[PDB]
Amino acid sequence: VNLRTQKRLAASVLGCGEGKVWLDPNEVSEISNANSRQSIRKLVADGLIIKKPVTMHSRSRARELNLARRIGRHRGFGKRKGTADARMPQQVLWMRRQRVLRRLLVKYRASGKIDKHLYHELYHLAKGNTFKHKRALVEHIHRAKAEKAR
Amino acid sequence: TKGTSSFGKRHNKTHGLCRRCGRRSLHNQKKVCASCGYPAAKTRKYNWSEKAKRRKVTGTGRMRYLSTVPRRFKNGFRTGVPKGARG
Amino acid sequence: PSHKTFRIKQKLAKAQKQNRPIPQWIRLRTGNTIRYNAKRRHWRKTRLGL
RNA sequence: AUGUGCGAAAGGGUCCUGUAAGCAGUAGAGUAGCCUUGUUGUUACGAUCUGCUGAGGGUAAGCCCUCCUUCGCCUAGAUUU
RNA sequence: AUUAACGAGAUUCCCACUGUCCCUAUCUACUAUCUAGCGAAACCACAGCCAAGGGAACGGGCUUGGCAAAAUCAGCGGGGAA
RNA sequence: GCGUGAGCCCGGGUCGAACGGCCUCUAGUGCAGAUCUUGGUGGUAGUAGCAAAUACUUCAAUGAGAACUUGAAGGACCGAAGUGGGGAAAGGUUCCAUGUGAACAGCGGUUGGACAUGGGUUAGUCGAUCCUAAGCCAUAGGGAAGUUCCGUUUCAAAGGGGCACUCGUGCCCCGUGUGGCGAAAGGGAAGCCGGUUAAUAUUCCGGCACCUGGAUGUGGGUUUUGCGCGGCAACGCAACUGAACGCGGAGACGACGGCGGGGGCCCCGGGCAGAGUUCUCUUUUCUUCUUAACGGUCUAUCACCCUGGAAACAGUUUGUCUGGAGAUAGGGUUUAAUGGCCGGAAGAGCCCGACACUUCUGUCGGGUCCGGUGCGCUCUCGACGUCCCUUGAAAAUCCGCGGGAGGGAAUAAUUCUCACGCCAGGUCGUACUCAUAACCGCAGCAGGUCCCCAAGGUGAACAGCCUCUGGUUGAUAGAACAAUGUAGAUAAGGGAAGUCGGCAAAAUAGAUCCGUAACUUCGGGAAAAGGAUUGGCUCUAAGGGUUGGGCACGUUGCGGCGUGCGGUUAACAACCAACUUAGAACUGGUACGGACAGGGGGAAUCUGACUGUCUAAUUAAAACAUAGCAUU
RNA sequence: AGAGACCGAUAGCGCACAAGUAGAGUGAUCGAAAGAUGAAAAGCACUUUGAAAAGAGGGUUAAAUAGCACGUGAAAUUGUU
Ligand SMILES: [K+]
Ligand SMILES: [K+]
Ligand SMILES: [K+]
Ligand SMILES: [K+]
Ligand SMILES: [K+]
Ligand SMILES: [K+]
Ligand SMILES: [K+]
Ligand SMILES: [K+]
Ligand SMILES: [K+]
Ligand SMILES: [K+]
Ligand SMILES: [K+]
Ligand SMILES: [K+]
Ligand SMILES: [K+]
Ligand SMILES: [K+]
Ligand SMILES: [K+]
Ligand SMILES: [K+]
Ligand SMILES: [K+]
Ligand SMILES: [K+]
Ligand SMILES: [K+]
Ligand SMILES: [K+]
Ligand SMILES: [K+]
Ligand SMILES: [K+]
Ligand SMILES: [K+]
Ligand SMILES: [K+]
Ligand SMILES: [K+]
Ligand SMILES: [K+]
Ligand SMILES: [K+]
Ligand SMILES: [K+]
Ligand SMILES: [K+]
Ligand SMILES: [K+]
Ligand SMILES: [K+]
Ligand SMILES: [K+]
Ligand SMILES: [K+]
Ligand SMILES: [K+]
Ligand SMILES: [K+]
Ligand SMILES: [K+]
Ligand SMILES: [K+]
Ligand SMILES: [K+]
Ligand SMILES: [K+]
Ligand SMILES: [K+]
Ligand SMILES: [K+]
Ligand SMILES: [K+]
Ligand SMILES: [K+]
Ligand SMILES: [K+]
Ligand SMILES: [K+]
Ligand SMILES: [K+]
Ligand SMILES: [K+]
Ligand SMILES: [K+]
Ligand SMILES: [K+]
Ligand SMILES: [K+]
Ligand SMILES: [K+]
Ligand SMILES: [K+]
Ligand SMILES: [Mg+2]
Ligand SMILES: [Mg+2]
Ligand SMILES: [Mg+2]
Ligand SMILES: [Mg+2]
Ligand SMILES: [Mg+2]
Ligand SMILES: [Mg+2]
Ligand SMILES: [Mg+2]
Ligand SMILES: [Mg+2]
Ligand SMILES: [Mg+2]
Ligand SMILES: [Mg+2]
Ligand SMILES: [Mg+2]
Ligand SMILES: [Mg+2]
Ligand SMILES: [Mg+2]
Ligand SMILES: [Mg+2]
Ligand SMILES: [Mg+2]
Ligand SMILES: [Mg+2]
Ligand SMILES: [Mg+2]
Ligand SMILES: [Mg+2]
Ligand SMILES: [Mg+2]
Ligand SMILES: [Mg+2]
Ligand SMILES: [Mg+2]
Ligand SMILES: [Mg+2]
Ligand SMILES: [Mg+2]
Ligand SMILES: [Mg+2]
Ligand SMILES: [Mg+2]
Ligand SMILES: [Mg+2]
Ligand SMILES: [Mg+2]
Ligand SMILES: [Mg+2]
Ligand SMILES: [Mg+2]
Ligand SMILES: [Mg+2]
Ligand SMILES: [Mg+2]
Ligand SMILES: [Mg+2]
Ligand SMILES: [Mg+2]
Ligand SMILES: [Mg+2]
Ligand SMILES: [Mg+2]
Ligand SMILES: [Mg+2]
Ligand SMILES: [Mg+2]
Ligand SMILES: [Mg+2]
Ligand SMILES: [Mg+2]
Ligand SMILES: [Mg+2]
Ligand SMILES: [Mg+2]
Ligand SMILES: [Mg+2]
Ligand SMILES: [Mg+2]
Ligand SMILES: [Mg+2]
Ligand SMILES: [Mg+2]
Ligand SMILES: [Mg+2]
Ligand SMILES: [Mg+2]
Ligand SMILES: [Mg+2]
Ligand SMILES: [Mg+2]
Ligand SMILES: [Mg+2]
Ligand SMILES: [Mg+2]
Ligand SMILES: [Mg+2]
Ligand SMILES: [Mg+2]
Ligand SMILES: [Mg+2]
Ligand SMILES: [Mg+2]
Ligand SMILES: [Mg+2]
Ligand SMILES: [Mg+2]
Ligand SMILES: [Mg+2]
Ligand SMILES: [Mg+2]
Ligand SMILES: [Mg+2]
Ligand SMILES: [Mg+2]
Ligand SMILES: [Mg+2]
Ligand SMILES: [Zn+2]
Secondary structure (H helix, E strand, O other), X not given: OOOHHHHHHHHHHHOOOHHHEEEOOOOHHHHOOOXXXXXXXXXXXXXXXXEOOOOXXXXXXXXXXXXXXXXXXXXXXXXXXXXXHHHOOXXXXXXXXXXXXHHHHHHHHHHOOOOHHHHHHHHHHHHOOOOOOHHHHHHHHHHHHHHHXX | OOOOOHXXXXXXXXXXXXXXXXXXXXXXXXXXXXXOOOOOOOOOXXXXXXXXXXXXXXXXXXXXXXXXXXXXXXXXXXXXXXXXXOO | OOOOOHHHHHHHHHHHXXXXXXXXXXXHOOOOOOXXXXXXXXXXXXXXXX
């Protein structure tokens, strides 16, 4: 008995690959009489032709390592292969910081904590490498208004 | 790399089928047949090859009209029908 | 190729109608000398020139 | 070809590595919860450490012993002088 | 005539390194090797054990001696002026 | 048996249609050699060999016969710059089904791209057909004995548009110009989803659309003084006359860099179904949860408009541009959906469950949700920037405008680019392969041959290594382990003593932190040279986003606001989210870029400045080219 | 159309035959091999062994020492006796 035609027809009807088609080993004579696509469907309904499941591929170990690195477990000096700028480029660090600092100054000026003359002077100070982060800018503003009070 | 490697790059055609003689001898870019000389009015023929002349001389084809002239000459190029024929 | 012209299509049709063996009753005629077909062509053996 | 026989296992000896899985602990840098607020207060997480443990694994394929462990086999078939 | 940088460009020395060497040993895979199946080519006057002699001045064959016992397998690189 | 000899004669066997002696005549008349010509056949010899691309094993069935046929079950490889899914050139039936003695598949064969008999390619929307490019060829003319050479707008009387016809015959305008071929990757009118076959499908069936050309009628629009209204404006609205002649726009264009928006893929959390594991653990691991063309409606950078008038200058990008030639601010208009919602459309497709059913046949229930994240990958759009002694096609075709020729109603008229309605769309290609077997290399040859799509982990990464979907298990086999080999490797002590010559091999190598000479065209040399660290576990610190802010009047089913104010919380509270960097303790046979991946260095001489190029198949160089300089 | 002191299938034209054919080359062009069963197919009915190809009997013929691998059937080279 030659069943090459039946296996090819089954894959098209089941919508799978020919490596996922199962033919009943004890009904080869009955299966060999199926020559049309209609007869293949009837043998699928009766349970002589089934589609096999996929092979296992799990990401359990992958997302386990990800969580351990959120608390700093696998990021030592013996675990780095690229350069510092390849892992975290400096241009991205600079671009983030300028957007953070410029977002704050617009917020203060809109509410009223500062006026435009102080806004302009702080803006060009931030363009220079003056304020290290958000905290440094806020402390500088408080001292500036304290001396302006006198 | 001349030889086996270079032979793999041959996938174009210098000549196609001629409309007058039927051989694959029509040059694709020049549009001139290398065998019968189409589209000139005369047919290409040279006296330094007797073999080539005999391959296409009169009598190598069908002679659709010329083969019935000797019979008409022998009877005098007459017209009409034989005496009291019907029709 | 799938792209063809009508002249090439006409040629390919004739080449396969001329590729069948001789009938059997030809071999029983009086004074016959034909044994087989001496002009058989195969796509894997001889290349036809367009 | 009945034997101090031949074969397949097993037990012991000899060598090689280096202390198995499992369970437990007043061991463990610390952390997060819950209560009567403890002299070990408990519940959860924890590389590793300690005990059972010179243990576990392998060992003739061209290592040794077994009348003192178990199971099987055997006085042919063919050719020639 | 000089000359920084550059070079799968030629040359000499130094440090490190090693079976390149003293001096050679051992292991793995595929062959070769044996079997079943399948199955070529180059080449070939006739052939195929030597020593000396003379000879076209370096013989497988001639002359005088040495000798000399079926059919065969794996390798080898002296000769066949291969 | 005869003859010195070339030769002649007879006996026996096989066989089946013509042949000889003697004298003259006549010639394509006698073979061992020519590396002689054509054909046939030996030894070598059952010999050399049939060894790149990791690999097969068990049971059953078929059959005279099974390592290389089919089913199931194991073990493996390709590892998304694939041994996957589709195409262009080229081939031409190699595609599908049934069957089969020989020959072919360098072993076998029940199998085959082989052999025999039948079957298979469906378009107004995908192409060709239309346009022009580099180029090729006609016409006017000039050469040449001539086959023919040049010439493409020229030293040419070179065209096209309208109106009635009694009925074609007849009238009237404009005129500088006047051929064709040439792209299945350039330019260009129009189709999407689901199903269906042994073999075709954006082509067949069902549903739902679109384009061009041709005729045409209803509804609506305009006009009673003739060809529409609104907005300060940018402009809007279902329409809303427009000939000759002319102006403009689209077609229509380079390479590279960072940044922002959108679709698809990847990743994380929850829920409903189904499956795998369960000595112990795991609210656990894996799979499905979809939405087309064509339309409606609300929005989305640039830019433009109105008010007003800026120095204590302001606005503002990751990247310094913008503004009295009018900024900030307040309010508007508009190019641009692959964005949200609705029609299409759940009736489809997909996942579960329960009954029928020899077949013919099926039938019925459920479900088909909700969020997050990013220097992620891929395609597309936008605003910016850099480079040039380099500035990056043409034509067909379609639209707007300037002008005002002609024509038209007061009961009808309307050459209204608005809605709906009627008819038609010819011809050729379409199967299959696109390569360790369908193309070219004499062949089923480790060679060569233009593209599209592109998953998880480690990691800087399209590096190497392992896996999922999909695909293979095909390269003659069985047994044994001699020499000599080809390919892969390790050696005590010495360390180039070997050799023409360190040829081959070994040694170094990622990342972080220190340190770095002579010389120099000041740019380099430079990763110069030379050092130290790196695992696991338990902790600590730093780098962000969104939403809230107190009174006094009036309106509104805690109101949301029209306001008059007051104020800068000595910056507080709640919620949300990935990664990157720095420090400490503990721990181990001191090991930790633990595989993969991965520079040896220095002091000098000769010579060419550098980057580039050549003898396809023995020479890659000091040879050629080059910028600069000089001469004619 | 008629002839010959011509050739007799490696000769005579390249071709006595489905020959300017099959086949090679991008192309111009290059270009073969291959005649004969018997007077007549009367071209082997039946039985038996074999999966089949075929063998052994038995038939036709004047002859199968003529079976379509077909008149006669030499040498090189090979098997048995
Ligand atoms: K233990
Ligand atoms: K112990
Ligand atoms: K060089
Ligand atoms: K050998
Ligand atoms: K053999
Ligand atoms: K001698
Ligand atoms: K002699
Ligand atoms: K006789
Ligand atoms: K043999
Ligand atoms: K192999
Ligand atoms: K393989
Ligand atoms: K068409
Ligand atoms: K139609
Ligand atoms: K066509
Ligand atoms: K057409
Ligand atoms: K042109
Ligand atoms: K002329
Ligand atoms: K085109
Ligand atoms: K069909
Ligand atoms: K109306
Ligand atoms: K209107
Ligand atoms: K273009
Ligand atoms: K983008
Ligand atoms: K994107
Ligand atoms: K996206
Ligand atoms: K991802
Ligand atoms: K469309
Ligand atoms: K100003
Ligand atoms: K930047
Ligand atoms: K790309
Ligand atoms: K008018
Ligand atoms: K098709
Ligand atoms: K197709
Ligand atoms: K193709
Ligand atoms: K990856
Ligand atoms: K990788
Ligand atoms: K060996
Ligand atoms: K060996
Ligand atoms: K040396
Ligand atoms: K020397
Ligand atoms: K290191
Ligand atoms: K010198
Ligand atoms: K160079
Ligand atoms: K060379
Ligand atoms: K070179
Ligand atoms: K040169
Ligand atoms: K100079
Ligand atoms: K001949
Ligand atoms: K040919
Ligand atoms: K007789
Ligand atoms: K007989
Ligand atoms: K005979
Ligand atoms: Mg920088
Ligand atoms: Mg050409
Ligand atoms: Mg009549
Ligand atoms: Mg001698
Ligand atoms: Mg001598
Ligand atoms: Mg000799
Ligand atoms: Mg002698
Ligand atoms: Mg040798
Ligand atoms: Mg020798
Ligand atoms: Mg006769
Ligand atoms: Mg002669
Ligand atoms: Mg001879
Ligand atoms: Mg002689
Ligand atoms: Mg051999
Ligand atoms: Mg092989
Ligand atoms: Mg070999
Ligand atoms: Mg195999
Ligand atoms: Mg691999
Ligand atoms: Mg693999
Ligand atoms: Mg097939
Ligand atoms: Mg078949
Ligand atoms: Mg074979
Ligand atoms: Mg065979
Ligand atoms: Mg077969
Ligand atoms: Mg065939
Ligand atoms: Mg089209
Ligand atoms: Mg011309
Ligand atoms: Mg002329
Ligand atoms: Mg054209
Ligand atoms: Mg195109
Ligand atoms: Mg229409
Ligand atoms: Mg107008
Ligand atoms: Mg929708
Ligand atoms: Mg929309
Ligand atoms: Mg503004
Ligand atoms: Mg809807
Ligand atoms: Mg449904
Ligand atoms: Mg197909
Ligand atoms: Mg392909
Ligand atoms: Mg190949
Ligand atoms: Mg081929
Ligand atoms: Mg990573
Ligand atoms: Mg073998
Ligand atoms: Mg070696
Ligand atoms: Mg050593
Ligand atoms: Mg040592
Ligand atoms: Mg040393
Ligand atoms: Mg070397
Ligand atoms: Mg260094
Ligand atoms: Mg140096
Ligand atoms: Mg140079
Ligand atoms: Mg060379
Ligand atoms: Mg070379
Ligand atoms: Mg004659
Ligand atoms: Mg002959
Ligand atoms: Mg002849
Ligand atoms: Mg004969
Ligand atoms: Mg017989
Ligand atoms: Mg006879
Ligand atoms: Mg014979
Ligand atoms: Mg004979
Ligand atoms: Mg003989
Ligand atoms: Zn021609």
